[PDB]
Paper text:
Triosephosphate isomerase (TIM, EC 5.3.1.1) is a key enzyme in glycolysis and catalyzes the reversible isomerization between dihydroxyacetone phosphate (DHAP) and glyceraldehyde 3-phosphate (GAP). The overall structure of OvTIM is similar to that of other known TIMs in that it contains 12 α-helices, three 310-helices, and eight parallel β-sheets, forming a classical α/β barrel fold. In OvTIM, a specific SAD motif (S157–D159) is located between α7 and β6, inducing the formation of a subsequent 310-helix γ2 (D159–I164), although the corresponding region is not conserved in either vertebrate TIMs.
The amino acid residues except for residues 175–179 in OvTIM showed clear electron density. Two homodimers in the asymmetric unit were identical with an r.m.s. deviation Cα of 0.22 Å. The loops in which catalytic residues are located form dimerization interface with the dimerization loop of another protomer, indicating that OvTIM shares a common mechanism with triose phosphate isomerization based on the dimer formation. The catalytic triad (K14, H96, and E169) is in the upper entrance of the β-barrel, while the SAD motif is on the surface opposite the catalytic site and exposed to the outside of the protein, as expected. The side chains of the SAD motif that protrude into the solvent region are not well-defined, while surrounding hydrophobic residues such as L155, M160, and W161 are directed towards the core of the protein to take part in the hydrophobic interaction. Additionally, the N115 in α5 is another characteristic feature of OvTIM. The side chain of N115 forms hydrogen bonds with the main chain and side chain of S156, stabilizing the loop located between α7 and γ2. The residues forming the hydrophobic core surrounded by α7, γ2, and α9 are also substituted with bulky amino acids such as M148, R152, and M196 in OvTIM. This substitution in OvTIM resulted in tilting of the end part of α7 toward the solvent region by ~2.2 Å because of steric hindrance of the substituted bulky side chain and N115 compared to that of the corresponding region of Homo sapiens TIM (HsTIM). Therefore, formation of short 310-helix γ2 caused by the SAD motif, the stabilizing function of N115, and tilting of α7 cause unique local alterations in the surface structure in OvTIM, distinguishing it from vertebrate TIMs. Interestingly, the cluster of hydrophobic residues in OvTIM results in formation of a long hydrophobic patch.
Numbering used by the authors:
A (entry chain A): 5 to 173, 178 to 252
B (entry chain B): 5 to 252
Write the structure that this text describes.
Amino acid sequence: RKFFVGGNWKMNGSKKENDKLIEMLTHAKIDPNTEVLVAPPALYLPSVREKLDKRFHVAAQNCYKVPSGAFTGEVSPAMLKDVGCDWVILGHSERRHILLETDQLVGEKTNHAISAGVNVIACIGEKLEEREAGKTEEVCFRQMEAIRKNLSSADMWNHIVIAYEPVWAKTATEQQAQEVHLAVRRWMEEKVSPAVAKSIRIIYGGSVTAANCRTLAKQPDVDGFLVGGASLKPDFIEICNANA
Amino acid sequence: RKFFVGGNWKMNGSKKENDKLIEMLTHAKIDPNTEVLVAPPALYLPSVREKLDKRFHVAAQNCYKVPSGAFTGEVSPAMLKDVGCDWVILGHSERRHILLETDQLVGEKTNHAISAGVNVIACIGEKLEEREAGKTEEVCFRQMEAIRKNLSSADMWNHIVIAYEPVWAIGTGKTATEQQAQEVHLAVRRWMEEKVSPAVAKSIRIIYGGSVTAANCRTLAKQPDVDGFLVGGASLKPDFIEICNANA
Ligand SMILES: [Mg+2]
Ligand SMILES: [Mg+2]
């Protein structure tokens, strides 16, 4: 499985700061076997995609579940493709828990994006009370099932990267991350197919820093990262190189 | 009060379709005393603003309530200003009722946008079951109060346009008459007079955000407390220009 590192800029960006990050990525020494993605705020997606070499993916941080219509404030996968973007992050913990997105909506968006030619980083993860009640697997499997049930065909998994976010984190160890990634992969093996489970990337979306990335990368079922704050700093390059 | 017409493109657009609308706006003949605004999807705000004559306002269809942070998928007013856009639509009925935005959240966003130098079209309106229970004013006043209460000072009303959406009509087979529209606009202006000030009530634009068409716009525009429109589907068509000219 090809190592996959996505930098989620979250609600951070400006012409000035984006220029700095683009120059950092353009001149950086990055392991050629790492797939690298960045996700700027929607306003800046067309410009970042125009300015970055195709070696880098550029992802939206959200999209909706139909190509057009009366949905003020929403953007569709067709618009992403229009501006050269072929990736989207869906179901991020902030969208589920702050902006109130349901499991079903994330699954509907995922199916629609892939149908429109956009690959999906599909995010899952449990909150603190859920982990403490022993429901990590119950919650993660429920979120995964809502995606599985909404896909139009089993080949769509070739266009998904699963991101596990330990929302509950209190600090998640590399052992705790590996434990969930393994459980999710075994779920994929049973509910989809061994072939998909073996090939699908499951990336870790907890706190990823220059200091902990190499230990996390060595876990056998951790295939990369969905990076938060470090994506805005030169440490992102070290994280991109965590598997090398 | 200066007549104000905003076109809400909703989730419709592409680089090439937007260029087509920009050409329509550029070649349109419009009364220079009318304020005209368009609101493209967020991906297209910088390109639309760069390409479209500065005589037209360019608005975001939504934004969030702090300048930056851990809010994946949200954009801030500071980013709007960074790409030259100084307007936003907030509290649109689709965001309230489909995306579940609260009265308080709309008020917090409105305050934050204005704080950043972004003017706000603040949308209000009641649903049918609320209207049939005699709660049109109760609902509209509750929504307005949540905005008022969250403003950092009453001077922020100089940066607000209120849009009344008759959700009870938009979302059903009913049509709101121009008399029904005028009746709500009058009550909202009187709320402004009583709860804010007469000076603010006299100057604030209250635009109608129901079904606005080439066929009904002139009758709606002549209503004394209707100061313009927030246009939906017709904003994507040449009919938008007739609506921009509805008061002349
Ligand atoms: Mg021309
Ligand atoms: Mg109707």
